[PDB]
mmCIF file of C-alpha atoms in Angstrom:
data_model
loop_
_atom_site.group_PDB
_atom_site.id
_atom_site.type_symbol
_atom_site.label_atom_id
_atom_site.label_comp_id
_atom_site.label_asym_id
_atom_site.label_seq_id
_atom_site.Cartn_x
_atom_site.Cartn_y
_atom_site.Cartn_z
ATOM 1 C CA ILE J 1 64.333 157.277 112.301
ATOM 2 C CA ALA J 2 66.195 155.632 115.122
ATOM 3 C CA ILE J 3 69.370 157.487 116.041
ATOM 4 C CA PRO J 4 72.009 156.520 118.653
ATOM 5 C CA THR J 5 72.802 158.649 121.612
ATOM 6 C CA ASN J 6 75.813 156.848 123.075
ATOM 7 C CA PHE J 7 78.650 154.561 121.695
ATOM 8 C CA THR J 8 80.885 151.849 122.818
ATOM 9 C CA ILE J 9 84.533 151.274 121.924
ATOM 10 C CA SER J 10 84.679 147.620 121.378
ATOM 11 C CA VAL J 11 88.046 145.781 121.060
ATOM 12 C CA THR J 12 87.747 142.434 119.079
ATOM 13 C CA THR J 13 90.445 139.891 118.280
ATOM 14 C CA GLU J 14 91.286 138.153 114.927
ATOM 15 C CA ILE J 15 93.911 135.311 114.930
ATOM 16 C CA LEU J 16 95.464 134.579 111.489
ATOM 17 C CA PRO J 17 98.105 131.840 110.740
ATOM 18 C CA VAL J 18 100.987 132.985 108.622
ATOM 19 C CA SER J 19 103.534 130.185 108.733
ATOM 20 C CA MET J 20 104.071 126.375 109.291
ATOM 21 C CA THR J 21 107.011 124.409 110.260
ATOM 22 C CA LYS J 22 109.718 124.112 107.560
ATOM 23 C CA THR J 23 110.282 120.308 107.100
ATOM 24 C CA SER J 24 112.878 118.478 104.954
ATOM 25 C CA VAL J 25 112.960 114.822 104.308
ATOM 26 C CA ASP J 26 115.912 112.794 102.754
ATOM 27 C CA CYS J 27 114.528 109.837 100.695
ATOM 28 C CA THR J 28 117.527 107.567 101.111
ATOM 29 C CA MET J 29 117.323 107.721 104.924
ATOM 30 C CA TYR J 30 113.698 107.245 104.979
ATOM 31 C CA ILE J 31 113.092 104.508 102.300
ATOM 32 C CA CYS J 32 116.477 102.860 102.700
ATOM 33 C CA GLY J 33 118.211 103.882 105.999
ATOM 34 C CA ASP J 34 121.770 102.471 105.801
ATOM 35 C CA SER J 35 121.254 99.906 103.233
ATOM 36 C CA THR J 36 123.402 100.365 100.248
ATOM 37 C CA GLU J 37 121.667 97.712 98.337
ATOM 38 C CA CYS J 38 118.448 99.406 99.077
ATOM 39 C CA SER J 39 119.902 102.588 97.674
ATOM 40 C CA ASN J 40 121.005 100.916 94.603
ATOM 41 C CA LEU J 41 117.555 99.609 93.996
ATOM 42 C CA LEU J 42 116.009 102.935 94.646
ATOM 43 C CA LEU J 43 118.202 104.834 92.145
ATOM 44 C CA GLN J 44 116.444 102.913 89.407
ATOM 45 C CA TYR J 45 113.211 104.928 90.036
ATOM 46 C CA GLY J 46 114.638 108.242 88.788
ATOM 47 C CA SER J 47 114.192 111.588 89.947
ATOM 48 C CA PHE J 48 111.247 111.055 92.272
ATOM 49 C CA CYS J 49 113.429 112.127 95.126
ATOM 50 C CA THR J 50 115.150 115.357 93.807
ATOM 51 C CA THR D 1 111.230 115.940 84.813
ATOM 52 C CA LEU D 2 108.393 114.327 83.177
ATOM 53 C CA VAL D 3 110.262 113.693 79.937
ATOM 54 C CA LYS D 4 112.938 112.119 81.882
ATOM 55 C CA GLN D 5 111.635 109.309 83.877
ATOM 56 C CA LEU D 6 111.161 107.824 80.398
ATOM 57 C CA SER D 7 114.827 106.611 80.858
ATOM 58 C CA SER D 8 114.147 104.950 84.247
ATOM 59 C CA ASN D 9 113.761 101.207 84.655
ATOM 60 C CA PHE D 10 111.513 101.231 87.575
ATOM 61 C CA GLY D 11 112.822 97.782 88.294
ATOM 62 C CA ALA D 12 112.585 96.317 84.925
ATOM 63 C CA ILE D 13 115.486 94.873 82.894
ATOM 64 C CA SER D 14 115.482 97.923 80.360
ATOM 65 C CA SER D 15 113.670 101.167 79.948
ATOM 66 C CA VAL D 16 113.287 100.583 76.188
ATOM 67 C CA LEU D 17 109.851 98.841 75.878
ATOM 68 C CA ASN D 18 110.920 97.357 72.647
ATOM 69 C CA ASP D 19 114.247 95.877 73.932
ATOM 70 C CA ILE D 20 112.219 93.949 76.753
ATOM 71 C CA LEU D 21 109.528 93.104 74.187
ATOM 72 C CA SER D 22 112.035 91.713 71.626
ATOM 73 C CA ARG D 23 114.315 89.974 74.244
ATOM 74 C CA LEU D 24 111.789 87.855 76.242
ATOM 75 C CA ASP D 25 108.720 85.642 75.788
ATOM 76 C CA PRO D 26 105.434 87.239 76.421
ATOM 77 C CA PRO D 27 104.633 85.824 79.781
ATOM 78 C CA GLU D 28 108.014 86.954 81.096
ATOM 79 C CA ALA D 29 107.780 90.371 79.210
ATOM 80 C CA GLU D 30 104.211 91.080 80.648
ATOM 81 C CA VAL D 31 105.522 91.634 84.291
ATOM 82 C CA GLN D 32 108.330 93.886 83.052
ATOM 83 C CA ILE D 33 106.064 95.968 80.871
ATOM 84 C CA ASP D 34 103.577 96.274 83.798
ATOM 85 C CA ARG D 35 106.328 97.530 85.855
ATOM 86 C CA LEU D 36 107.223 100.164 83.474
ATOM 87 C CA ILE D 37 103.580 101.068 83.015
ATOM 88 C CA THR D 38 102.985 101.592 86.716
ATOM 89 C CA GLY D 39 106.147 103.653 86.992
ATOM 90 C CA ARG D 40 105.128 105.927 83.974
ATOM 91 C CA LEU D 41 101.574 106.273 85.350
ATOM 92 C CA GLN D 42 102.877 107.307 88.739
ATOM 93 C CA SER D 43 105.223 109.915 87.039
ATOM 94 C CA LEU D 44 102.364 111.353 85.021
ATOM 95 C CA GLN D 45 100.009 111.480 87.970
ATOM 96 C CA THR D 46 102.568 113.438 90.048
ATOM 97 C CA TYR D 47 103.022 115.827 87.112
ATOM 98 C CA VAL D 48 99.274 116.483 86.963
ATOM 99 C CA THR D 49 98.851 116.992 90.703
ATOM 100 C CA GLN D 50 101.666 119.455 90.934
#
């Protein structure tokens, strides 16, 4: 039997992500910008954006 | 949200498949029906992924 006669206090590190950046995107400003005609075309696609 | 999106045109002249079908000739109705099919496939795929 091998038995230890001494010891070491070891401090190790563990890194864990917990959160990511909260991002919001408006369709009408991404797909259409300031175009009202583009928005009128886009609203024919339904509730994709909600 | 899936049941709705059956009332969306997706760019066609109507969301009712029969109205497009019984109000245009075949070669012109095919594009409209294809547009509806594409939109509804996209909606169903979004549902399944979610």
